[PDB]
Amino acid sequence: GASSVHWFRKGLRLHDNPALLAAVRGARCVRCVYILDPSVGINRWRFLLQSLEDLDTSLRKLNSRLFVVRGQPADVFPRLFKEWGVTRLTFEYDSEPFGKERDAAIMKMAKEAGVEVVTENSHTLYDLDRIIELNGQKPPLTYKRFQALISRMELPKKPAVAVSSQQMESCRAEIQENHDDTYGVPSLEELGFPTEGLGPAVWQGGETEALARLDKHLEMNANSLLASPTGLSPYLRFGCLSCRLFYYRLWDLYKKVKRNSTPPLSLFGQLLWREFFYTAATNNPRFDRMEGNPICIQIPWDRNPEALAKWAEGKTGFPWIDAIMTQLRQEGWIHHLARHAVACFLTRGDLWVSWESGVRVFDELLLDADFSVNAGSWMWLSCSAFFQQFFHCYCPVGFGRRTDPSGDYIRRYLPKLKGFPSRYIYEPWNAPESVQKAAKCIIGVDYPRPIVNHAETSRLNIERMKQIY
Numbered sequence: 001g002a003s004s005v006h007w008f009r010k011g012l013r014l015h016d017n018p019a020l021l022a023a024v025r026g027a028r029c030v031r032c033v034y035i036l037d038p039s040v041g042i043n044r045w046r047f048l049l050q051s052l053e054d055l056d057t058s059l060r061k062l063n064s065r066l067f068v069v070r071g072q073p074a075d076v077f078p079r080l081f082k083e084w085g086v087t088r089l090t091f092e093y094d095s096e097p098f099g100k101e102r103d104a105a106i107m108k109m110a111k112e113a114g115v116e117v118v119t120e121n122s123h124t125l126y127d128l129d130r131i132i133e134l135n136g137q138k139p140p141l142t143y144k145r146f147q148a149l150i151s152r153m154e155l156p157k158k159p160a161v162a163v164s165s166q167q168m169e170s171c172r173a174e175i176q177e178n179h180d181d182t183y184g185v186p187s188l189e190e191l192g193f194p195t196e197g198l199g200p201a202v203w204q205g206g207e208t209e210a211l212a213r214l215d216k217h218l219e220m221n222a223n224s225l226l227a228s229p230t231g232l233s234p235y236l237r238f239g240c241l242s243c244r245l246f247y248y249r250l251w252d253l254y255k256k257v258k259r260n261s262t263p264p265l266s267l268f269g270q271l272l273w274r275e276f277f278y279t280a281a282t283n284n285p286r287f288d289r290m291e292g293n294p295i296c297i298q299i300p301w302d303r304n305p306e307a308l309a310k311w312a313e314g315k316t317g318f319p320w321i322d323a324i325m326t327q328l329r330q331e332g333w334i335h336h337l338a339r340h341a342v343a344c345f346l347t348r349g350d351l352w353v354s355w356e357s358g359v360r361v362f363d364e365l366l367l368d369a370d371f372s373v374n375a376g377s378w379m380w381l382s383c384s385a386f387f388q389q390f391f392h393c394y395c396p397v398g399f400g401r402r403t404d405p406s407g408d409y410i411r412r413y414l415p416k417l418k419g420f421p422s423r424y425i426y427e428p429w430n431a432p433e434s435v436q437k438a439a440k441c442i443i444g445v446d447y448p449r450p451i452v453n454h455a456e457t458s459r460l461n462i463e464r465m466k467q468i469y
């Protein structure tokens with residue numbers, strides 16, 4: 001039979017893995033491979049490492065192991081083809097422009113080597129290219145048009161069966177005694193990160209964590225802004241959780257809870273915004289840039305290195321903004337409303353810095369942000385693309401006050417401000433000296449003064465946006 005390699009990139013799971021099913025079918029031998037390539041934050045890397053460890057543990061239960069190989073796929077796969085005598089290579093499709101070109105090169109090489117290639121598109125709900133075909137060979141640039149297209153398309157494919165124990169026993173690969181020395185999942189130190197006092201990850205990686213969270217998930221305040229134990233978005237981004245499994249379990253719950261067996265599209269709204277951005281990005285190599293991006297409004301943003309760095313580090317002097325950016329840096333996830341506040345502050349609201357710089361910082365820190373979804377949300381938020389009708393105004397003080405009147409969210413991530421009363425914690429520069437000394441926090445010494453006058457900068461910025469449009 002076949003000597004198969006399943007290539008993990010996304011789709012870091014055994015459930016709903018049709019590409020892995022294709023590798024297993026009629027195989028004498030199967031080897032699951034992740035290729036580690038020797039800017040990116042520690043939370044992203046730790047999440048990846050934990051997901052790979054989970055896969056290795058899962059494969060141990062099926063009399064197998066994960067093969068983590070270091071190098072570039074273009075160099076690695078020829079050596080592996082010859083060394084393992086591979087006859088079949090399978091992986092989950094990657095719609096993103098860079099991944100498409102990489103994968104096309106691997107497939108052409110595997111054809112020239114005589115190796116069979118199978119790909120499955122189980123990272124998304126739909127065939128993105130089919131959506132583009134039905135829209136006249138262009139991606140839809142509004143969510144309303146995107147929703148009209150998929151409403152007439154056939155439902156997403158149901159989640160595939162996870163591979164059997166008997167299937168994996170039929171093609172167990174020989175594991176050498178030094179497998180961990182050659183193919184082991186590296187540690188954070190081995191990736192170049194010294195671990196100085198790091199506590200348990202707020203977002204533990206892996207398919208097992210993903211499936212446990214899904215079960216609890218199907219069972220606005222300060223608590224709403226905290227990381228939730230039923231949160232699923234990092235697991236969808238890495239593929240620890242199948243989006244089609246989520247889609248249909250969500251549907252099953254709707255039918256059990258409500259009478260109708262016809263749920264509104266908004267119940268899938270998060271999956272559909274995901275899907276919409278993937279559709280728009282797949283044929284646009286410049287999706288995450290302004291210049292040369294055919295869907296992006298050209299806007300003369302300011303270059304402001306100091307303000308950009310202060311925003312990125314949570315040193316703006318607006319506690320709402322700084323607390324969000326602190327949560328993002330420390331944990332790797334922030335609420336969508338917090339993303340609004342922080343993106344609008346950087347771009348059209350206050351700093352007039354390009355959404356491209358926001359994409360870069362979020363790419364480094366945000367666990368659920370990939371090329372398509374990150375850049376898409378930033379162009380959408382900053383009114384650079386997707387036919388944005390009105391400019392949503394978020395005050396870096398009032399929106400925080402409205403979302404968490406208690407101020408405890410600030411107190412959690414900015415402990416230096418813990419002593420400020422709720423009436424001042426979003427604008428501590430307005431606290432009298434006596435209040436600042438009682439809180440043991442002198443504005444301008446212990447915590448910075450606000451770096452902009454929001455009233456004045458927001459007025460100038462909203463007029464520039466009107467003139468541009």
Ligand SMILES: COc1ccc(-n2nc3c(c2NC(=O)C2(c4ccc(Cl)cc4)CCCC2)CS(=O)(=O)C3)cc1
Binds near residue numbers: 233270336337343380
């Ligand atoms: C600006 O930086 C970012 C803000 C959000 C994300 N992001 N990440 C995920 C998802 C989103 N985006 C959204 O859902 C929307 C959105 C856009 C902009 C903002 Cl500010 C807030 C929400 C798109 C339009 C309305 C909802 C959905 S997901 O599973 O597909 C995971 C990424 C980067």
